[PDB]
Chains A and B, each alone.
Chain A
Amino acid sequence: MENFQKVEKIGEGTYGVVYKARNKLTGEVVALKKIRLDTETEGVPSTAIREISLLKELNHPNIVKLLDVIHTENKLYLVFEFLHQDLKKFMDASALTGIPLPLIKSYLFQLLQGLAFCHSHRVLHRDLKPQNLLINTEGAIKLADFGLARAFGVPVRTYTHEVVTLWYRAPEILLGCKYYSTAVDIWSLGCIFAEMVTRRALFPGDSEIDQLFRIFRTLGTPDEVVWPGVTSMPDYKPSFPKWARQDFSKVVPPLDEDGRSLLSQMLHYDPNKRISAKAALAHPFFQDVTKPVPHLRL
């Protein structure tokens, strides 16, 4: 760690803290995650065990490169490439003007390429939300924060305490499915796509049941025709209000037919019928994709 110069704090982050830093020998600007040990007791945290072992297999331009791991007796450091900011801060900063559609398209295209690669390398991200999506001045976007990621060479079980924040959570999970699948990642990407487009979170629930009902009011209450099995799921109640599917022109006004189509397939209720990252990239909506550059404030 003697070669690294603290530049500034850039987040408290999946325990403990995250610093911008400069390599004093090469000039490489880098992000450092400090894990204490302490730990508290109990050794290398499971979360860092997965983050390191999975992310080091994931070398791709839309995935935040893990550069190094420095393992003391008393301290553990993950060193990452550095990116100037997150999508959340950028959507926030873009509230007045909005994010132009061609950059929305670039970003979503790029997120699907990173995510296809995760999925083809048997990794589920599971925590896709805008603060875990990092961007630079040249107009790239990368997936970051693999604290909750999991290998799925064998099925991954669902767990009440290790789950994406509510707003980007797939209906499978809210309804108590036993296994995660790749589709939960697409769902999250779908929500984010719509949020970039409308400037407003698509399903901003106060609670699990509120999250569900917000999903239901927009896409309609799913039944056994739409989603075979749904009635038998653990946290399906037959008391659920039966809402009807809102007109998609009205939920994402700015989008054309290709955009509405893609989003519909990303928000498909049944996990087996939800579009895959690989198939998403072949959607006509990406016909004319380019790579704009954002205007970042920092």
Chain B
Amino acid sequence: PDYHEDIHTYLREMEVKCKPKVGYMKKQPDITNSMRAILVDWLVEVGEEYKLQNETLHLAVNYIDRFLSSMSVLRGKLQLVGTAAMLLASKFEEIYPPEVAEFVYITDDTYTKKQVLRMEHLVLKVLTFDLAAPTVNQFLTQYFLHQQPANCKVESLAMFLGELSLIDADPYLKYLPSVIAGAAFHLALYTVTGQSWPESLIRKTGYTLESLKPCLMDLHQTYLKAPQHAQQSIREKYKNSKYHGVSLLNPPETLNL
């Protein structure tokens, strides 16, 4: 707690300096939001298959969006960007990463070791080694302390909603990680407990319920539409009992804001 406020302040500074270009997919000649959505969904599977943390997946996505913010990428190389990003994120966050051979194997050998490594080096150059990016998880972790009491279903559900925001560059690129986390948390807390974004967290973040509204409205819509959504790996992941079945919970029909 001495340093907890300072961590939060600093993560707020840093999340602004690792923000992707919000408009980047429009300037990107051979790729789209839906190609991105596929890749990320696959990264979720890859993370499930190798038992990676959730933070690892959130970092990789941040890396990928920063790289595409300043590099043109053809379609057939997008997955190589994604793979190297996952590999990098593993080396940063995992206790020990899977081996490169695995990351080659998970591509159906559509690339080679040489290519994955050469891309690792490229992502590192393009991100200037700035790998320690704030994620919505880091912010949820911090918010979870303001529960009275802790409620493991609220936690699991916030993380689920958070993880959904990864998939859809429209609209989730326009929101900072701290704001997505703010919404995800309020929405989970309402769905599970019927409470709202608490006064303590307003004081901590400066974010009012008003401020989170655009993100909430979008997040709610995503939650409502999640089972029709084209990529499902996350809804799958979070029907498990690890996450208290929260992907099966029925969203409210209104938020009454």
Interface residues of A (CB under 8 A from B): 41-46, 49-50, 52-54, 56-57, 69, 71, 73, 116, 119-122, 151, 153-155, 157, 159, 161-162, 182, 276-279
Contacts and interface: CB of A to CB of B under 8 A. Distances in A.
Nearest to A120: B6
A46 B97 contact: yes
Nearest to A162: B95
B11 A122 contact: yes
B56 to A, nearest CB: 10
Interface of B: 2-3, 6-7, 10-11, 14, 53, 55, 87-88, 91-93, 95-97, 99-100, 113, 116-117, 120-121, 124-125, 129-132, 134-135, 137-138, 141-142
List the 10 closest pairs (A to B, CB-CB), nearest first. Answer: A153-B138, A120-B6, A53-B131, A46-B91, A276-B2, A278-B2, A119-B3, A49-B91, A120-B3, A159-B95
B100 A52 contact: no
B92 A50 contact: yes
Contact of B55 (A42, A52, A57, A154): A154
A116 B130 contact: no
Contacts of A155: 141
A116 B131 CA distance: 22
A120 B129 contact: no
B150 to A, nearest CB: 14
Contact of B100 (A42, A57, A122): A42
A116 B92 contact: no
A276 B117 CA distance: 40
Given A42-B99, A154-B141, A53 B130 contact: yes
A71 B113 CA distance: 19
Consensus secondary structure, chain B interface: helix
Contacts of A159: 95-96
Contacts of A56: 129-130
A43 B100 contact: yes
B129 A157 contact: no
Contacts, number: 89
B10 A122 contact: yes
Contacts of B137: 153-154
B132 A53 contact: yes
A49 B92 contact: yes
Contacts of A69: 129
Given A154-B55, A154-B141, A43 B87 contact: yes
A161 B94 CA distance: 13
A279 B97 CA distance: 36
B4 to A, nearest CB: 9
Contacts of A120: 3, 6-7, 10
A157 B94 CA distance: 9
A153 to B, nearest CB: 3
25 contacts: A41-B113, A43-B117, A43-B120, A44-B91, A44-B120, A44-B121, A46-B97, A50-B91, A50-B92, A56-B130, A57-B14, A73-B121, A122-B10, A122-B11, A151-B92, A153-B11, A153-B132, A153-B135, A153-B141, A153-B142, A154-B135, A154-B141, A159-B96, A161-B96, A278-B2
Given A53-B129, A120-B3, A276-B3, A44 B10 contact: no
Given A42-B100, A43-B100, A120-B3, A151 B141 contact: no
Contacts of A50: 91-92
B7 A121 contact: yes
A41 B92 CA distance: 17
A14 B96 CA distance: 16
A49 B123 CA distance: 12
A276 B7 CA distance: 14
Q: By CB atoms of chain A within 10 A, which of B124, B132, B142 has the most?
A: B132
B34 to A, nearest CB: 30
A53 B92 contact: yes
Contacts of B135: 153-154
Given A41-B100, A162-B95, A153 B7 contact: yes
A119 B1 CA distance: 11
